[PDB]
Design a binder for this molecule. Structure first.
Ligand SMILES: O=C(O)CNC(=O)C(=O)O
Ligand SMILES: [Mg+2]
Ligand code: NI
Ligand SMILES: [Zn+2]
Length: 331
């Protein structure tokens, strides 16, 4: 068995290996990369996502979200308070202001210590989930707006044609902006490219151990667990590495820098935070190996998780017994 300790693997494809996206994902899996839940892909030196980032300031963040925490430093939830629209240039100036800027630090480990100690005492503002792309149309390799669609994969594997579309999303972050513990919708893969700016630190639980994280979360968030049998789908709960180690939960951590891709694998729980002003692009995707995970994915039916149009068909075809209850949650 390849990668039996479930370590995060880092890949350096050549320009020739960067041509065929599906083939390279399958290669990484042949080496055991999926067992970690997360892999890093460093593009060949010949590649670029676009020529410059000098002309992005006029992108609008229609609904910036202020991430307000409740709880204790290592075990907390966050809710998202909606703020007035602002441009990417306006948000960048805000991120760099004395109230929001990254503090002085020695290295990534010192910054990580500061994040866990102090996050709850601040409310950073995140531009999330903005439909769009920063890849140049002429970039042919690993262009997250030109991937094979999940609807086409389902149709190729299972023969059923379904409605829905699959497009990328932009994230504009600042110091302390936080992504809560989650797997993807329908336990899909994700791919995330850090276009510019400061790093993003990730934490991940191997897919084979995901239920250990779920049992800890039910213990730590007991009201939320009574409310919903899949409350991590709400994407609001944070648990620190120190608390995970205290409770014997297997995990790994890695820091992504600008110019690097991360891939999350089916049922790989992940969480993390941004170091300072940055911009990332991400999209979900599928492969043949995903289908069995899609069929077994948990679902939130309490009403909180509310998701995209295209998840309807995935539930309807892969999980027909659950469909009626899930759809009641959506309506
Ligand atoms: O970058 C973020 O805020 C969160 N991204 C992801 O969870 C991802 O790419 O799967
Ligand atoms: Mg612009
Ligand atoms: Ni994710
Ligand atoms: Zn729910």
């Amino acid at each position: 068995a390849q990668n039996p300790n479930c370590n995060i693997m880092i890949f350096h494809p050549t320009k020739e290996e960067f041509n065929d996206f599906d083939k390279y994902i399958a290669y990484m899996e042949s080496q055991g990369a999926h067992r970690a839940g997360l892999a890093k892909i460093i593009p060949p030196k010949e590649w670029k996502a676009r020529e410059t980032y000098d002309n992005i300031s006029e992108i609008l963040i229609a609904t910036p979200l202020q991430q307000v925490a409740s709880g204790r430093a290592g075990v907390f939830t966050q809710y998202h308070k909606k703020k007035k629209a602002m441009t990417v240039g306006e948000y960048r100036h805000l991120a760099n202001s004395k109230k929001y800027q990254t503090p002085p630090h020695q290295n990534f480990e010192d910054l990580e210590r500061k994040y866990w100690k102090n996050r709850i005492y601040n409310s950073p503002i995140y531009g999330a989930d903005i439909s769009g792309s920063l890849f140049d149309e002429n970039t042919k390799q690993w262009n997250l707006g030109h991937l094979g669609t999940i609807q086409d994969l389902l149709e190729k594997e299972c023969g059923v044609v379904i409605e829905g579309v699959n497009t990328p999303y932009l994230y504009f972050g600042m110091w302390k902006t936080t992504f809560a513990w989650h797997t993807e919708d329908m336990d899909l893969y994700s791919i995330n490219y850090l276009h510019l700016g400061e790093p993003k630190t990730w934490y991940v639980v191997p897919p084979e151990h995901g239920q250990r994280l779920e049992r800890l979360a039910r213990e730590l968030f007991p009201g939320s667990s009574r409310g919903c049998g899949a409350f991590l789908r709400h994407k609001v709960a944070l648990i620190s590495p120190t608390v995970l180690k205290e409770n014997g939960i297997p995990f790994n951590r890695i820091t992504q820098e600008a110019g690097e891709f991360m891939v999350t694998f089916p049922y790989g729980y992940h969480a993390g935070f941004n170091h300072g002003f940055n911009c990332a692009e991400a999209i979900n995707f599928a492969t043949p190996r995903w289908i069995d995970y899609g069929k077994m994915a948990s679902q939130c039916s309490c009403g909180e998780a509310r998701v995209t149009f295209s998840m309807d068909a995935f539930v309807r075809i892969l999980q027909p017994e659950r469909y009626d209850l899930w759809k009641r949650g959506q309506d």
